[PDB]
Structures are given as structure tokens and as C-alpha cells.
Symmetry: D2
Subunit: 333 residues, 4 copies
Amino acid sequence: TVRVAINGFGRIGRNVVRALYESGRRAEITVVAINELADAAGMAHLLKYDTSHGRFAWEVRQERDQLFVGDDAIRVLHERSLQSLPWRELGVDVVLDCTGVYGSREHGEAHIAAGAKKVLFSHPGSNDLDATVVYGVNQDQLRAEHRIVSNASATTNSIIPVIKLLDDAYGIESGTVTTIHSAMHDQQVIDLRRTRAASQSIIPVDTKLAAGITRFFPQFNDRFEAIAVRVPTINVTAIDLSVTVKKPVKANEVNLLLQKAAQGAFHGIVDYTELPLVSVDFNHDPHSAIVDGTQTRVSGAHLIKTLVWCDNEWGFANRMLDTTLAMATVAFR
Amino acid sequence: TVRVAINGFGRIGRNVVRALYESGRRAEITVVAINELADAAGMAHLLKYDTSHGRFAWEVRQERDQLFVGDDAIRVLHERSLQSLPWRELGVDVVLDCTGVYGSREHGEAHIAAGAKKVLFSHPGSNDLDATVVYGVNQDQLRAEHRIVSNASATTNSIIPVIKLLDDAYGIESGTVTTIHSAMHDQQVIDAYHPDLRRTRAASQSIIPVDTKLAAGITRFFPQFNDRFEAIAVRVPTINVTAIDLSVTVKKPVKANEVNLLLQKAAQGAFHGIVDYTELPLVSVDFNHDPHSAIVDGTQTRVSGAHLIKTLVWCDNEWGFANRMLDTTLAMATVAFR
Amino acid sequence: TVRVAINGFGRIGRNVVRALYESGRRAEITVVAINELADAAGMAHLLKYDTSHGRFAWEVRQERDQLFVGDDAIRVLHERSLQSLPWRELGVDVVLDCTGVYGSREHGEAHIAAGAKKVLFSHPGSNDLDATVVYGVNQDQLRAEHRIVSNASATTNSIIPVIKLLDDAYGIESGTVTTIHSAMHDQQVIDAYHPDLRRTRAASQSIIPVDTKLAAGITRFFPQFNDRFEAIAVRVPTINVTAIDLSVTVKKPVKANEVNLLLQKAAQGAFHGIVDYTELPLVSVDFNHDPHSAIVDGTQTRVSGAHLIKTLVWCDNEWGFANRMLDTTLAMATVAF
Amino acid sequence: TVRVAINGFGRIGRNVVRALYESGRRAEITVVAINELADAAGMAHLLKYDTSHGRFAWEVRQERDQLFVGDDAIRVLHERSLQSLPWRELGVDVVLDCTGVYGSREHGEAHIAAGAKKVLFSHPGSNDLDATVVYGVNQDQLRAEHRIVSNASATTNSIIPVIKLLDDAYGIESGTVTTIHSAMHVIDAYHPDLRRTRAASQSIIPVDTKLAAGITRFFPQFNDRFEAIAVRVPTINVTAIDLSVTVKKPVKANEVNLLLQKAAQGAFHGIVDYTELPLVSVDFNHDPHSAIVDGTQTRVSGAHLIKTLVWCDNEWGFANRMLDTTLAMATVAF
Ligand SMILES: [Cl-]
Ligand SMILES: [Cl-]
Ligand SMILES: [Cl-]
């Protein structure tokens, strides 16, 4: 198995661990250690119980410096600084850094200096990492020397594959995006709105989505913008993409294109549906994106609107494991 | 004063009465009757207490067949058939039909046959009426002969003036809109089948897509948008403030700060009291009980390239609309003397 | 196999079908027909997709007048009139009436005249029925001649076992109870006015008082408590999972840790799988899809003086009760034969 | 006027300013300074917008080290320690410490050493203060020597006058209470209380409650005789308190109700209110009573076990009481 360590055991790190067992990736990957500055009993407790994701089905036990998931023993560490992480002794092939605080090149090099062979950050990080992977779009650009990698973000994983599809087919000239985030989620991007009363408002929030799009597709500088709101919902996100395109199109053609991708080159990554569903129906769906084809529109012939769903935690948590495996694989090429 | 009667005393009818008193339009308009199939004590109760609008500041009492707001006495009616409405006897100048159920020309004609000089429906209408008014945009098109009129909707009243401001300045070539509706006053959970399977699902938990015709409303008003406009919509569990997220391609090249200046000036000038503009860091409840049709949130404005403008527009989905009902009423009752 | 028909396929009827499959009770009970005044395709869709209970893990299909769960074919009926139901032709052992609309003795006799051998109601019904079963407490009172039975309600199933246990141990003198209900599907209004003015108010923003039948359920079940129990209740905007907050004065002096040990031992013994017990730091969602009738939250147990016991008890108000509908059905069809 | 300063401009400190102006107390009290470790432009924004009742109606501006409500200038400070508060130089009669974190006798003394004649804490604080006042119940007990005072808390101010009324009339043997809190309104971190991290918007969540300890400092006889639990639910603005007491006198519900109703018309006019209307929690939003008894929910089991449900705005009654108590403290100093 690929031996992995997780640095950080908040929502992302705990979901990565849940996704490892639930998805059967446990046949390819073993979590050997988890590092977090908190009580191990508290870690076992939050691993087991979750608002969004239900009770975890595997037996969870904790004793001394071990967390047990089924018969698997995972070492629990509490190290404040990266320099003293015992990654040589654990034989770590990839460290999945889920802290959301570490994310530079220097941080990745600290993990490597501590003995991890490779680092994968659960967010965009600084702009001098080795590679950013959006699984399904560019994982085949990974090289063995890409030792510090970003996995992008949930919302960029969600919409980049759709931007890619429509650009290749139709030629995007410009685009604009709105994300409707669930209110529970901790920090997609970085405020006098945050300190407000409970009013159950729709709350404008700062988005890094356009920066991530234009980092991925620098031919889209000066051509892409994004806004975002938080609403008091139950864990699924909607992304509302509007793009102008060179090639003339009708909605029915756009849906066909997206439906073929879902059933073909993007199977497991982009899904497509025309069922009368609501956001909660995508709760715990491992896809990066589910295109809601009842909502596709073309204004005239050149302004495409498409609405895409994602479980902002579960999709990204499974991508972290897909990317991990693609790194461990290229390492052995 | 213009003597008006309200048919229907749901949220829109109730808000219209509150807006009459809060706005100072009681100087020009008298509500002489309200018809609803409901207990009169319950009508008084709901007029007094509301989740979105708070306690009504006027004293509300109820006795016999009268509802009193302060010292005004309003007749309370409980007539099932439009033909039985005693509008001629009351001398009604305009009936504001706020039932959401009546909406055709023939419904308007029944109100007029019962003695109302003119009728204003609180939604776009069940068929084709004499006119549809977005106040601040085409009320100057009303003539005396327009007797059955629709006031459009909270949503079209909000976005149509913004589309006008942008189109007049920059030439809109195509557009697409998403409305984020508030689900506050719908059933929060539900145990019933409905032909639309989205409607059987708990509104309090999900972003839910809903059917929208906003795009046809829009194209009626802007024929030049050929078929160059589409729209979608979702309902979310939130308070009664709606967001409309409008994306249009324009001919003139433009920057975001220019668009915001255009809208900010239109709010001080020609759309004063109709369109407002803000640049503060606000959240949706900040617009609760605001009487404008549209509030442009300039912190949210974006231009992709020099031609694809995004604007986020807020409105209380009941309060601006209820105030627009009174404005249109007044414009109909005054052109009656041409 | 106990052959059963579901009358009504709203939330309770669909949850009863899901619980049949998820609990393994499919080894003793077969659903032969479901009757509902709604499209068969809509019935299939809603069995598959749910807000509180997520996606049904079984494959659901629908074709003509059949609904398929895995390889099981279930006949779909759309009858407005009870006496027109083909229960004789289908050989129905027990009808689970989950409409929430029927519930009188005469309604039960209508299902029987149509051919069902016995009827079980998914609510308290009239004061008229042959038996009201709180499974775990009085199913052994069932007899072959009980034909028309009520299963009580999710909240009476949840608090009656606890009340029994405290009464046997300490002797209850008086009691008062508050239900903190999650969003209530039967409190919805369509029109805009309702003779109950609380029902017109937006439910997401408020704690809303709501009429409760709980103390009447308690006194029906334990008549020695008439004029010694009262109940109030409120509605809060959570999607599922209800808290019952029970306060009782008792004769025997007692301490919180004793009351917890008693209730903890009951959960491990005579009430295993009916009443659970926890001292974990959990929130209401952690009980979602838990099949117990009751989970006592040991962290909230209080005794004031030596005589006034407060206990907070959770239940998934949908899932415990649906699992009990199947238990009581099985006990009904078994005492029979 | 009584010159007051506010220390800490979170929810309660902003409410105390709004309440000063809306209640007409501006007639007797002047807020002269506010201290907060936050930007002043931000403070003025939250004063204006964060109200639960529309935009605050007075004009709010901010410039230099000043915050203006209408024509009033209020000095703004950003001192990180009590020692260096310039109270003496401002002439402060009472500091309302609303930080929710200072609350011992030593903190009180530090405010007074800095110049405030008297201190009122907006929470129960230490058990070594000079007095705790539930206004409408024990303010006639304040004297000139009570300089460091707690005003108890919103819920405590809600249920204690009702506990007093029922005890005077029927003799409370023992009591149990449940508080149903609305949202104050999910930080992804670990806390020793593992409930803390859980999404508030989704659940009924048990919270650790200070209600019984507050009831039993106020009435020490109830000390092995009163308990409290509490949950938090995703609603807004208003809290419910569900009180159950065993009493010595036999009693009927309609009598309990008449008693509480008359108390609302008489000795507790303006403090406890009473209703039988079909109302919901949001109907008491911005209601300035410490308590509204919901008469429709009153019950008596077997003649000795009274249940009563009581509503309060989370903060608005309490903010108004901060001023009543402030006024009473500044009044017995002369
Ligand atoms: Cl649902
Ligand atoms: Cl309401
Ligand atoms: Cl959680």
C-alpha cells in the first residue's frame, strides 16, 4: 500500500479518512499516522460522529497514542512544528496536509526534510508549489519530481472540469461565476459581515475562485470573475457558471456534451443528471461536480449558463485520495 | 383621497395596508374595505404580528364588521364570489386584487362590473390585461382606458430597472439571470405528493431549483433582446430578501467601477426611491423592510473582460413590491382624470 | 411470511418500507401492496431520495402498477375508498394504515370488511381500539382477538418506557412533560389563514408552541395517572429528531447517578433495543436513523431535592417508530397463529 | 445626567446604547465613552446595522476618536488593560462592563481605581461582588456602598421574578428548569466540550447552563433543591424558559395564570408581562420586558406541580435592565 500520514484532523482530514474506508481505497492506501494538536479521544469522537456525514460505520476506538478504525491501528501524533514530525520512522510516502495553515514551498520542504517523500496540500497554497492537480483534467501532467503538490480547492475541482469541457468544445471568450456555499463550511477563501447576528441571511463572501481559475488557465486572465454567497443550507454547494463562447450552441447540445463527459472521459469526476433533485440529494456524493442539466441555458446562441452541484467536502476528500495515488504511481514509474 | 379596496388578505394584502400607513400614502389613499375568507379577528391578528415585518406600530382593533387601524375604520368582507362585492356601494376607485388566485381579464371585468373603476393585480396575471407596470420605468404609459392592470412582480420590479439602466448606457446584447429566492414563507417541511417532485422536499434544508419565467417577463419589456435572454432560479432557506444575479454582455467596453457609478447616480437621480445603491459590507437582512424595488450591491459588481457584466441586486420580496402597488394605484387613479 | 399492505405512502409509510429492508425484518414480513393517491413514479422517487434519511441503498424501480425494491414486486394501488381495497384477493394478514387520516374503530373495520385480517394504525386513533401497543412494554398483552390495534405515536413510544421504569423503581406521584419537536409535517398549512394562528407563522425563524396529545397518551396508557400528568410542546426548525423533557416527582428519595444507573441497566437488559442510554457528548443529529424508541441522555439527568427527576430523552421520531410498526405487526400476526 | 462608559462593544454593549436612545433613558443617562479593541469605523457600522430591528433609527457617524449618535459625541478608546482607562478624566459615574470576560471584584476595583465611581457587569461574574440585581425584584436593596455590581443575565432576569411570584403565593418546595436558547450566531477546531464544534444550524444541542447556579445564588435556600439543563436551537432573537416547580399550596392552572397576570398589571408592570394570544418566539423580538409569561402554556399536575413557559428577547430586555439598574445605582450614591 501507499503509506500516508495526515497532518491536520479537522473536517478535511477526518473526511479523507472516512472516504479511504468507504470507497475501498484502503486496498491501495494505508493511513499510518495522524497529527493534530488536540486530545486523541476528541479526535476519535469527531471521526465517529458528524452532522453532515452521519455516524461513521467502522468501529472507532482510541487508546494511548493509537486511533483504531476497525482492526487498523493509526499512530496519533501531537507535534507543533513540522521539523519534529517523525516521518522517516513511519515510512511516509505522501503526507496529506489538511491543516489549511501550512501551504508554502517552505512548508512542503519541511515535511520532506522530516522524511515524507511527497506532500499533498488540501488547498491552493502559495504559487511556487510544484504542481496543482485537478483530478480528471491534469493528473497525467504529474512528474516524479513534483514532490510538493496542491490539490486546488473543492470549488475549483468542481468547475474547472466543466470550464475545460466547454472551452474545448466551444472556445470560451469570457466567464463569470457565482458560488452558493452552505453556511456551515469553515473557510473557502479570505470582515464586518462575519461578526453579524443570527438572522439566517444570505451573506456575501470573498471568493478565491477566479484566481484559481486563472492560475489553472492563464489564457483566462482579464476574462474571468467570481462572487460568492453563504446561505444557511445543509452541505451542498451550487456553482452558477456563465460563459461566452465563439462557436454557436443550443442548450440541448451543451447538455449532450456534458452528459457524454459524465458517462465517458470524466466518469467518476463529473456526473450529469436530469432528475428533479434538490441540493441534499448530492450530500455524500463523491463526484467533484454534478451538472444539473434541467438548468442549462444558452442566451441566444453564445452565452452559456450551467448550474453544478457538489458536496463541497466529500468530492474533494475523495480527490485527495485519487491525486495521492497518482503521485505514488508516478513515483514508481 | 383615492378610495381603494383590497381583495385578498394574505401577506401581500396585509403588507400593502402596512405600507399605506408607514409610507405616508394615507395622505392620498383610503382603504375602505378588505375582503378575505377568514376570521376578522385573525385578519386583525396577522396584520398586527408578522415574522418578517415585526409588530405593526399602529393600534389594530376589530369589532363587528370593522377593522380599525388607529382611528380608521375599514369594512371587512367575506365574499366568495367577485359578483357579490359591494364595490359600487363603496365607491371604489381601484381594487387591489392581492389574492394571487384571481388574475384574468374576466376576473378584472367582474370587479369592474361589481363597481370598481379600475383593478390592479398583485402578480403578472393569468392572461393578457390592459397593461403591466413596473413603476419607475413605464407608469407614464398608463392612460385612462387601462382599467385592468398588472403590477408585475417583486422580482421583475427589481431587475427590469437595472436592465434598463445598463442597456441605455452600454447596449445589452444578451443576458442570463439567476434568482436566489427566499423560502421563508413556504412550507418548511412537507408530507404530500406534488406533480413537481422538487416541491415535495424539505425547503428548510436545500437549495431547491424552481420554475421561472423571469426571462419571458424580461423579453416582453425588451423586445430588442430577441431571444437573447434566459433565466433560472432556486429557493433557499433564508429570510425574505431575494438576490438576483444578473449577467449581461454589452457593446460599449466597460469597467466595474464605471458600472457602479452609473447605478449609484441613477439611484440619486431618475430612479430615486425605486433603485438604491450600496457599497457597504452588508448581509441580506440589512435590506429587510426596505421600500426600494432594487438595491444594487456594488461590492458585488464584476466585469469579465470589458463586455460581460455581473451585478447582484437585492430586494425585500414583499416590501418594495407592496409600496409599488400603492404607487401604481396612485398613477392609475390620477390618469383617470388624465 | 406475514403478508402486509401499506395504506398511505407518505413519510411514515415509506420509512416503514425502508426499515423492513434495512432491519432484516424482510425475512418475516413481505409487503404485498401499497395504496396511495399519488403517481406510482413519484412514489418510487420519494422512496429512493429523502432529506433526513438520504438515499435508499436498495435499487428502486417502477413499471405500470408495480413498485420494485431489489427483486421484490410490490403492487401499487390508488383507491379513494377503503371498502374498495383488494385485501381479500391479496390475502392481507395485517394492514399498516399510515395515512394519518384513518384511525377510528370503524375505519379499521372497513379495512377488515375489505379482507385484511388485522389492522395496525400508525397513530393513537380513537379511544376505541382493541389495543394500543408500546412495543417493549405491553406487546405481551396482545391476544388473537385483538384485530384493530394502535401503535401509539413516536413520542409516546419514547416516553412511556421511561415513565414505566421510573415508576416501578421510585413510584411517580406527578409528572409534567415538554416535547421539543423537530419540524412537523402535519403542522403545515396551504391557504394562508388557519383557525390555529400559530400555524400560519414562518417556522424556520421561531420556537412555536404546538398542541400536544402526549399527556393524554400517558394517561390512556397508565390510568392511575389521570389528573397527575400534563404536557406542553414546541416546534423548532431542525429537520428530524425530537427531545422529550420529562419531570416527575417521586416517592422514594433518589439521586441523579442512581436514576442513570437504573436507566442504563434497563437499556442493557429488559429494554435492549427499545431504550438506549448514552453519556457521550452528542447533539440531536447523532440520533438520526437510530432505531431505538428512546435514547436517554444521561448527561442531562437531574434530581432536584431528592424527589424531582428531570430526564431528557431523544428519539428519531420517524425511524424508531417505523421499526416498532414492524415489531408490533409481527407480534400481531404471531399471537394469531 | 448620569455619565456612563461602556467597556466592551460586542452584542450587549451595542444593545445598551440602542436601548439608551430608544427607551427615552437618554433623558437621565449619557454614554460618554466606549472602550473596545476593534476598529472604530467597524464599531459604528455594527451599531447601525446589527440590530435585529431594522437599521437603528438615530443617525450614526464615526470620526477621529468619536462615535456620534445623532448630536451626541461618544469618545472611543482602544485600551488593552483596565489600569489605563481614562475614566477619571472623563468623569464616569458608572462603567457598564459588557466584555463578558472581566467580572471579578479585582476587575471592578481596577475600573474604579481608573476613575469609574461604580461598576455594573453584564453577566453573573464572580461570587465575590457587592450585589447581583434582578431589576424589579431586589433593586431597593442597593445602597451607596454597593459599588461593584452584577446585573445577573438575560435568562436569570427572566425566570427569577416568576420564581419569586410563585414562591410568595404557593411556597416552592423544589424546582427544575429547561432553557431553550436561540442562535447567537462553525469554527473548525477542537474544544474540550465536544458539542461546541457541532453545526448549530442543524441540531438541538445541549449546552452547559448557568441558570440554576444563578437561581441558587439569588435564593440560597434552593441550593440542593433546583437544577437546570439547556439546549440551543437554530431560531433567532428569542429564548424560552420552561419552569417546573412543586409547591406546597394546592393550586389550579387558571389561578396561577391570574396571579402572574395581575403581577404583570401591578408590581411587575414593565418587567414581567403576560399574554394568552397565539404568539410565536419572534413576536417577543425587541420586547423590553425581562419576562413574558405565555398563559396558554401554563399547567398544574396533580395540584402541586406547576409548569410555566416564559419568553424573553435574548438581549433587549436585559439591555434595558442594565440601564434601570445603572440608574438605580447612581441614585443611591446621593
Ligand atoms: Cl424531504
Ligand atoms: Cl409569519
Ligand atoms: Cl458537525
